[PDB]
């Protein structure tokens, strides 16, 4: 149930911030699916079932955020203005990226569908695949991911700033410090794509290849940033 | 989090019939962290601030260990500067207390001196082997240090076996935080003459006899 | 004097509390002893000397005592017999004779600290 | 209130996983009804009231799932990663099948409407009733039902795997084991239709008749599978 055996969970009691937060997460994953049109015929029914792969990817992504949220509020049981503020920023980012994720997930499902050879349907429905549009694709979703992890870092830092008020022990202080580092490290990968895309060194698709390729090397690039700080 | 925001907080608290910070000004061990926060130029800065607190009637002139302790435990002052040993008396009182990092001065941290409580055997004692037995097999044991600690806390014990228990205490964490920001005292024979020089210097400047510049002059000699 | 031999890892204090109720209802003393190596001290002492009145050990050691002639044949009435599980009586049987009273089934398990190890091997 | 008198309910306190879950179930049944258009005229009003039979069937179906969920989280009070994962898979399946159920319920209500003689409205609105489409109908809803019961079996097995951590007694162990069997047995009936439909032995509607006929013989076929394992 819990992550650490040395951590004393201050947020075992459910609060308004957590209840409100659960409503928003439930609404996000629910409306992602149920924002679709109701099938009126067999043809619509089969079309609607092609959407489950894109939705599974979206849902998996949203619960992962929900989990991090659950663990934070479980650890510290925080309920102050600044926690409320940072919490709102988080849910706000989530909400604005629900329908854009539905889009990205459908787009990438078609691209990966073409590769593997499952389907051969058109991508002209999405509009013109131009350099500017493919760059904005990275910058958009990259800015989204960066923000979510950035906010998680700020939230843990707020708990670190209130370590004494929360009566955090040496183990708990260590966890909190490690959780900040983790979220900043997670944050850097989208920050690095975003910056590369915005400068655009090549002036062509090469830029987008590199930017996209940093996510495939998430684990190794995270280890490099972590290793650089430890080596000094 | 900073020393420089205490005067503002004190103005706020004095309106509600309460002090902000009360601590032992007589003993230099308590005033040294503020004095040594920056550093000389650092000692001049740190002490002038301490002098300005008494000059602005924020702190009392003859604030000692007893009236500071009592005031905090009674619920008259919002803050105090003390060691592990002082916690048990707070627990006795009905005061929801916290132990934390010492305030920063001029951005940099206040460097408190670090002491190692130590037991020595008197050279002119016939019970040298009996004392060694007591110290080793009875005191410096898990059971032995526990007994002392439940009376008045020892702080971060020297026993290796006590690491888990120390690490579970939030007040110990705050103690270790300040200990890292401070430094261990040299054991040298000149420490006595040093401490006396600082004890007088702080009292003279606090009461209003010698100037801050003239205090460091007499103390360096 | 009623003397009982049971291992020191068992509940001899509790066995004594039963023995204390026995003395109240009869007048016989019930002392409970726990000597080291009683499984191999019983067949030596009980053969020659007096030893205990009643011996407590896992059923596996009792066949050797039975063959040697160190144990009396148990004759419990149907009503007492019926109070215990029939499979338990089988363990305390050597050559069609009941050689002891079954108390409890014992098996080793993995005892683990949930704090140090929540999902053990 | 409780199913078993020998069961010690570990989940009497409400948690985030349960709160989140309640939001999703409420949203599913709510949006099923309220996804319809708002009547603007008397004609729309009467049309909208024809939808209550299909909705009653859908709602009845969803609360039955909600009940099983309520009982599981009541029994074990689980809150770990794997429980979260399996729980998400469940809610995901639910969500993707909300609008398809609305469809099936409306379709079958017209078919049963025609039989009994209450109404005589067209089924051409649903598209062509072809062998391929009627086969996909079984495979779709059959795959949905199979998954829900499959997930409930996995959830109970996760609790069984943590029997010692949960301090489950002999009665509780027995219940858990029985709950796994129940859900696998429930799971098999849709698994058997689905397989029969996918192979398609007859190459015509006969396939669909048999596949559909297994649900009418749910109770007896469940007893056969249960009897086979006990007889050995
Ligand atoms: C890997 C294999 C899977 C590839 C799946 C690709 C899905 O691609 C996506 O399909 C759905 C099919 O409903 C289309 O979606 C369309 O139908 C749904 C049906 O409810 C409507 O809600 C929506 O208005 C319409 O856009 C998307 O516009 C298309 O981008
Ligand atoms: C057994 C007797 C009952 C038979 C009921 C059959 C209902 O059949 C169903 O009716 C509703 C009538 O609103 C139709 O629904 C139609 O009207 C509703 C009215 O809000 C709109 O939301 C929807 O866009 C439209 O599809 C379905 O398309 C039809 O399939
Ligand atoms: O005040 C100067 C004085 O400070 C230190 O003594 C501390 C002692 O270490 C603590 O345990 C505590 O009890 O308070 C004392 C000060 O009040 C130095 O150790 C000592 O030499 C010096 O005189
Ligand atoms: K809508």
- What residues are in contact with ligand 3 under a 6 Å CB criterion? B 27-29, 115, 195
Residue A68, helix vs strand vs coil = helix
CA atoms within 13 A on the CB side of D87: 28
Which chain C residue is nearest to residue A2, measuring alpha carbons? C118
Instruction: Report how this structure was experimentally obtained.
Output: X-ray
Which chain B residue is nearest to residue A173, measuring alpha carbons? B173
The angle at the Cα of C8, spanning C6 to C11, to the nearest 5 degrees, equals 75
- Work out the angle between the directed axes of helices A98-116 and A131-161 (0-180°, nearest 10): 130
The angle at the Cα of B2, spanning B1 to B7, to the nearest 5 degrees, equals 120
| DSSP labels, D86-112 | HHHHHHHHHHHTHHHHHHHHHHHHHHH
Q: Which structure tokens are listed for B137? A: 């097999």
- What residues are in contact with ligand 2 under a 6 Å CB criterion? A 40; D 36-37, 47-48, 50-51, 53-54, 106, 109-110, 112-113, 118-119
Question: Measuring from atom 14 of ligand 3, which residue has the nearest CA?
Answer: B29
Query: Which residues does residue B183 pair with via DSSP β-bridges, in sequence order?
Result: B113
Task: Mutate one of A10, A158, A159, A167 to test the B interface: name it (highest B CB count within 10 A).
Answer: A167
Nearest CA to D210 out of D117, D146, D134, D143 is that of D134
Contacts of B45 (CB under 8 A, 6+ apart): B37, B38, B39, B105, B106
Contact A1 D98 (CB under 8 A): no
D198 class by beta-carbon count within 10 Å (0-12 exposed, 13-18 middle, 19+ buried): middle
- What residues are in contact with ligand 1 under a 6 Å CB criterion? A 36-37, 47-48, 50-51, 53-54, 106, 109-110, 112-113, 118-119
Separation of alpha carbons A187 and A89, rounded Å: 16
Separation of alpha carbons C77 and C71, rounded Å: 19
Neighbouring CB atoms inside 10 A of D3's CB total: 11
Subunits adjacent to chain B (3 or more Cβ pairs under 8 Å): A
The domain ranges of chain A are: 1-232
CA dihedral B174, B177, B181, B183 (to 10 degrees): 90
Residue D228, helix vs strand vs coil = helix
Q: In Å, what is the CA distance from D49 to each residue of A64, C90, D17, D42, D54?
A: 40, 73, 35, 11, 10
Q: Which structure tokens are listed for D140? A: 């779709």
Listed resolution, Å: 3.4
- The distance from CA C16 to its chain's CA centroid, rounded to whole angstroms, is 14
User: Do B213 and B32 meet the contact criterion of CB atoms below 8 Å apart?
Assistant: no
Paired sense of beta strands B113-114 and C2-5, if any: unpaired
Q: In Å, what is the CA distance from C24 to each residue of C12, C20, C30?
A: 18, 7, 11
- The distance from CA C115 to its chain's CA centroid, rounded to whole angstroms, is 35
Q: Is D165 on the interface with C (CB under 8 A)?
A: yes
- The distance from CA A137 to its chain's CA centroid, rounded to whole angstroms, is 15
Q: Which structure tokens are listed for C5? A: 């031999």
In the CATH hierarchy, which top-level class contains the domain B1-113+196-220? alpha beta
Question: Measuring from atom 5 of ligand 3, which residue has the nearest CA?
Answer: B29
| Residue A180, H or E segment | helix A170-199
User: Do A172 and A6 meet the contact criterion of CB atoms below 8 Å apart?
Assistant: yes
Q: Is A5 on the interface with C (CB under 8 A)?
A: yes
The angle at the Cα of A158, spanning A156 to A161, to the nearest 5 degrees, equals 110
Contacts of B48 (CB under 8 A, 6+ apart): B212
User: Do A226 and A185 meet the contact criterion of CB atoms below 8 Å apart?
Assistant: yes
Q: Residue C33 has what DSSP assignment?
A: E
D127 class by beta-carbon count within 10 Å (0-12 exposed, 13-18 middle, 19+ buried): middle
Subunits adjacent to chain D (3 or more Cβ pairs under 8 Å): A, C
Question: Measuring from atom 8 of ligand 2, which residue has the nearest CA?
Answer: D106
D5 class by beta-carbon count within 10 Å (0-12 exposed, 13-18 middle, 19+ buried): exposed
The angle at the Cα of A215, spanning A211 to A217, to the nearest 5 degrees, equals 105
- Work out the angle between the directed axes of helices D98-116 and D131-161 (0-180°, nearest 10): 130
User: Do A211 and A196 meet the contact criterion of CB atoms below 8 Å apart?
Assistant: yes
């Amino acid at each position: 149930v819990g992550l650490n055996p040395n951590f004393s969970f201050r947020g075992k009691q459910q609060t308004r911030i957590e209840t409100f937060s659960d409503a928003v997460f439930a609404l996000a994953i629910a409306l992602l699916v149920l924002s679709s049109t109701i099938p009126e015929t067999f043809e619509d029914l089969w079309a609607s079932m092609r959407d489950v792969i894109p939705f599974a990817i979206c849902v998996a992504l949203i619960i992962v955020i929900w989990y991090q949220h659950y663990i934070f509020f479980l650890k510290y049981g925080l309920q102050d203005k600044v926690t409320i503020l940072l919490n709102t920023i988080l849910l706000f980012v989530l909400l604005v990226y629900v329908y854009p994720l539905k889009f990205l997930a459908r787009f990438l499902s078609e691209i990966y569908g073409g590769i593997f050879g499952i389907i051969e349907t058109d991508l002209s429905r999405f509009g013109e695949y131009s350099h500017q549009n493919l760059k904005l694709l990275m910058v958009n979703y990259g800015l989204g991911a960066f923000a979510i992890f950035l906010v998680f870092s700020l939230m843990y830092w707020r708990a670190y700033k209130m370590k004494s008020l929360l009566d955090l022990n040496s183990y708990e202080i260590f966890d909190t410090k490690s959780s900040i580092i983790a979220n900043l490290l997670m944050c850097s990968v989208p920050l690095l794509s975003l910056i590369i895309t915005l400068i655009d060194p090549w002036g062509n698709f090469r830029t987008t290849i590199l930017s996209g390729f940093l996510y495939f090397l998430y684990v190794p690039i995270m280890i490099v940033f972590g290793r650089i700080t430890s080596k000094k | 989090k900073t020393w420089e925001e205490i005067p503002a907080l004190d103005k706020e608290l004095k309106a509600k019939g309460k002090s902000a910070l009360m601590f032992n000004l007589q003993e230099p061990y308590f005033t040294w962290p503020l004095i040594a926060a920056d550093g000389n130029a650092g000692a001049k800065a740190g002490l002038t601030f301490l002098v300005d607190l008494i000059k602005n009637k924020h702190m009392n002139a003859d604030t000692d260990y007893s009236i500071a302790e009592a005031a905090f435990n009674k619920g008259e002052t919002a803050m105090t500067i003390n060691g592990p040993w002082a916690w048990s008396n707070i627990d006795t009182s009905k005061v929801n207390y916290g132990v934390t990092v010492l305030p920063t001065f001029k951005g940099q941290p206040s460097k408190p001196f670090v002491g190692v409580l130590s037991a020595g055997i008197n050279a002119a004692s016939p019970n040298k082997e009996l004392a060694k037995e007591f110290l080793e097999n009875y005191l410096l044991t898990d059971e032995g240090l526990e007994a002392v600690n439940k009376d008045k806390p020892l702080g971060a014990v020297a026993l290796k076996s006590y690491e888990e228990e120390l690490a579970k205490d939030p007040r110990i964490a705050a103690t270790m935080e300040n200990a890292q920001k401070g430094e261990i005292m040299p054991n040298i024979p000149q420490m006595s003459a040093f401490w006396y020089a600082v004890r007088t210097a702080v009292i003279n400047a606090a009461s209003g006899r010698q100037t801050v510049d003239e205090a460091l002059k007499d103390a360096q000699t | 004097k009623l003397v009982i031999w049971i291992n020191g890892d068992k509940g001899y204090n509790g066995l004594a509390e039963v023995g204390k109720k026995f003395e109240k209802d009869t007048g016989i003393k019930v002392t409970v002893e726990h000597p080291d190596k009683l499984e191999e001290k019983f067949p030596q002492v009980a053969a020659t000397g007096d030893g205990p009145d009643i011996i407590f050990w896992a059923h596996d050691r009792f066949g050797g005592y039975a063959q040697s002639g160190l144990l009396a044949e148990i004759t419990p009435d149907k009503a007492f017999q019926d109070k215990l599980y029939p499979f338990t009586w089988d363990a305390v049987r050597y050559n069609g004779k009941l050689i002891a009273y079954p108390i409890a089934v014992e098996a080793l398990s993995l005892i683990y600290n949930k704090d140090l190890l929540p999902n053990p091997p």
